[PDB]
Amino acid sequence: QGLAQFIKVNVTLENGEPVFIYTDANGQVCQGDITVTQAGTITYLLNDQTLKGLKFVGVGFVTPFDGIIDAVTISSDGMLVQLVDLDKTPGTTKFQFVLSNTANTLLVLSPAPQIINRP
Amino acid sequence: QGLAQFIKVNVTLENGEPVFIYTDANGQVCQGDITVTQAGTITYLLNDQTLKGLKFVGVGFVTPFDGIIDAVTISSDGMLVQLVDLDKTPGTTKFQFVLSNTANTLLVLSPAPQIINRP
Amino acid sequence: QGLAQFIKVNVTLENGEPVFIYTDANGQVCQGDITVTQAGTITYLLNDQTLKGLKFVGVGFVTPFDGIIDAVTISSDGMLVQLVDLDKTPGTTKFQFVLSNTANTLLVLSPAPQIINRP
Amino acid sequence: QGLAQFIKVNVTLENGEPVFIYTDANGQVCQGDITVTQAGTITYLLNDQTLKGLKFVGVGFVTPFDGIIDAVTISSDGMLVQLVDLDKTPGTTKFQFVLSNTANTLLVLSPAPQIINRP
Amino acid sequence: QGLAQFIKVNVTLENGEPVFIYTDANGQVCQGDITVTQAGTITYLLNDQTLKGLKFVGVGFVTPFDGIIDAVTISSDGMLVQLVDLDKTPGTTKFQFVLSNTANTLLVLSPAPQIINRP
Amino acid sequence: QGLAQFIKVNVTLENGEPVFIYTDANGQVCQGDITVTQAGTITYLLNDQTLKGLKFVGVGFVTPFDGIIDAVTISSDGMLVQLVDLDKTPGTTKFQFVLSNTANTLLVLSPAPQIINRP
């Protein structure tokens, strides 16, 4: 077993464009990098306040073969994505959320890469 | 946050037909019902030893609106499915795994419904 | 050639949960097992009265390699599924309908397995 | 109920390009138009001998709202497609098979439209 | 590099059935065959005025291995399809648009094959 | 009409991880930003030399509603993606390629955002 973490992915529009605000369980804006020690899951819940019909389509990595995150799971409605760590690979990785929208056929990327860390 | 549980779903064939054997972290065959207390995730990992190209396609419920499990997530390769409990609804639910195979176009169901419990 | 049978799959909600009522051509509630003699097709038509956006996603079997039903076909809108018997394999099989819904990401299973028989 | 008809769709290549040969149950090459009297199903089974990885993706009509065929169902492996007549609409319609292939991203169309007739 | 051509695919209904009207940049109805000299792209934009929820699903060819068009690309919303010529294969090919609709599960085919020519 | 540009997206692995090398028609490594003046298409062709089964799944933007690129089209095999400019919106946008792979369920992102410019 391990730890199940939950983060909410709030998306609003400012000047026509997406803004991503991450909140934890206690409705605090999330500060800094995710440090993982146990194996486990990080579940991201989409709160789309854009009116652009956003859905998760996956989570993107520049270094996808680094083994830090072992798998990604996604719900059929695109409202949840999970990062899965099965084997506790040490190191650091960075990722961006990838979303579809209903206004156009471009995919949407979260701008600031999220960092996950295992000491 | 909550608890991340991991169960392996071993599938073999006996007399031409699937047999599902569930194992926990310590490689023990799983005994009894899953009792949940915290919110969290249960991750199921497919170990297909059938040669029939099995993939998870989802998790089926006879009472899908009971709120016990709030969501299901699935990996793109059909090797992982997760049950997600966000809001800790009390009660009991039963489910079966639903899989595709490459030998024919029938879906595969796990026979013995798995039971999840919150006191 | 063979026989084309048609059954309607009425789904309503009772106490928040699905109830499946099968009707034949003459609007009679269906009684007993389907006995097949010729090759052919059984077409199931979804009449979703749940307001939960149900769609067929396939038909599930605990013994999918038994050869009784040889294939399943599905319409693009999930309103029809067909069981196909090409080679008249003798014996008995049991199955459940598997449906998606728009309220949540859990799959829906029909509870009472339908039985198909060839003497 | 009605009649379940089965036709095999043999595809070979001649001078690099697809040739469609239809055969009935008795392995006779199919002659003329399909005349339907009862409601029912026509099941088409793909026998791809092209080495181009052909799969049915649907059945195309120039007059899709004519009501002659009421629905199309397709198997998950693209090896079967069925035309469904639920309500016995009188008249004549024409259609072509639409297939994907693994050599390129163009869809494949059967050349000679198949005609279905109800007097 | 090459030439990017754009054609609009207007679809209306007459007597219940689709009518395809092609217009060029200057809103002229398109006359004759497309003669290509350079490599390049032909982009088709769907203007669906049918109320039948039409979407491109691909472009169909009776002679898909002729090499005249090398690839087809499609937008996620089915509003654009492109024919791609990478290697300037000489000759002539014919094609039809293949569309889904939301009224029924039959695919829709454009009737008059469009001809593309390279001298 | 407009200009059809073609760029090849070569992907290799260095130290286990993807490296993206862009080449133009004349097999030159691509230098600087794409400056567009006419409407048109930019076609990207995937040359995957990673052995990780890469496929395009789309093109991601941090500012997807900026109108610089109006649409994205993708081939069914994920070997081609196209950026489409229909209405010549002035300004600058940045994007990354988003790819699936067959080794794991993480999406792959190209690291250095590509810049497109209209003066």
Ligand SMILES: [Mg+2]
């Ligand atoms: Mg790892």
Ligand SMILES: [Mg+2]
């Ligand atoms: Mg709940």
Ligand SMILES: [Mg+2]
């Ligand atoms: Mg059989």
Ligand SMILES: [Mg+2]
């Ligand atoms: Mg009819």
Ligand SMILES: [Mg+2]
């Ligand atoms: Mg060519």
Ligand SMILES: [Mg+2]
């Ligand atoms: Mg624009």
